[model samples]
Target: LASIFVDVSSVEPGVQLTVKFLGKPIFIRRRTEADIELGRSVQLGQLVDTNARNANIDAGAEATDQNRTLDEAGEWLVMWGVCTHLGCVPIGGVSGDFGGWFCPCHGCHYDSAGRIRKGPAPENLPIPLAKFIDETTIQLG
Candidate 1:
């Protein structure tokens, strides 16, 4: 898996997050959660750039806002869990009209795969280099 370094204070929304997607390194959006779980693995050739919107919405943050997902768990999942549009941290799931994450920042939409299925944003949420080292362990560094 690949590792990424991001400057929080910088305007750049995402950090360089690396993980083993399949077998190669992928550069997906940086998620607030530290760990993730990939049920399966695959070998992707290039490193995609996923933004902050991919990070699963914080349940706590959504509790008061009621605009994020609380049931989703990334503590043991993939890295590119956010949207690519405005980086607002997509609201809703990944399919249908309500499916996929939506960015309140600019109304951008993203599918479950972190791809820009629709929205005002420019590109799809990038995928980073990542892989599952074990059932519970993740290797992104």
Candidate 2:
């Protein structure tokens, strides 16, 4: 698999960094307590798309917030940054009513776990195959 590494030592909590992979954005965010709580708090019934869509996990997995995270603590969130509705890039750093990514095009809103919340998004922000190679470095494929 083709992969790239991103040094995340300088990325602060509550901030996200985007790297270009195959000309598509791959988002890596160091989350906070609130972001973790916000994601976990949502019930499955509240999700617009109920599949986790995380490539690291089983394809049949449900979209619970726990499955959306890269770490057991839910502090690391890594996802593909393209909008599921129409391939628009969603704005990170706390946009949208759900306090996650907001795509200005077609009004697609995603939650902290990258789960599609509202508008025309057909699914959650997909997670790429990723893993932490070290404490502050993430390898994405």
Candidate 3:
């Protein structure tokens, strides 16, 4: 198979799953309402990388919380769990200062929107060509 399919039905709100695809970890987060609110509340001035860096949208799109999510409701946050500063993979679940993944290697921080907030990362967490084929099934390439 060229792609990977994940069943996200069992994941609760505020929960996250790290799955391997194309030899890289992908973050599949079922964001809670609070998570959504906090992510959106972030301002561009507080970020280091203002670009979305997501393949699913226009290249020039701003790195807003809504731009990083997979669904219109801003519920699913999927991103390649890699740090832009170096090759280290970020840790999820207990996200750091920005409430997203933090690279343990150098303390690079990403916000709940996957945008680079603090530290040395030069770009937002990348989003692959992923989509929901059904309510609970995600097809990732």
For each candidate, the alpha-carbon lDDT, in order, equals 0.37, 0.91, 0.87
lDDT at position 141, candidate 3? 81
True-structure RMSD, every candidate: 13.9, 1.0, 1.2
TM-score of each: 0.40, 0.96, 0.94
Model 3 clash pairs are: none
Is 1 or 2 the stronger prediction by lDDT? 2
- Give a tens-digit lDDT track for model 3, residues 3-54: 8899999999989998998888898999888789998998878778888898
Clashes of each: 31, 0, 0
Q: Worst lDDT window (10 residues) for model 2?
A: 1-10
Once fitted onto the true fold, the runs of candidate 1 whose alpha carbons sit more than 4 angstroms away are 1-77, 81-83, 92-98
Task: Highest lDDT: give the candidate number.
Answer: 2
Error of 1 at 135 (Å): 1.7
lDDT ranking, high to low: 2, 3, 1
> What tens digits encode model 1's per-residue C-alpha lDDT throughout 1-141?
245333323322223334334454333332333212211121122212223232344322211111111124432223443444544455543333323456777677554334454557776554333344544333444
Descending-TM-score candidate ranking: 2, 3, 1
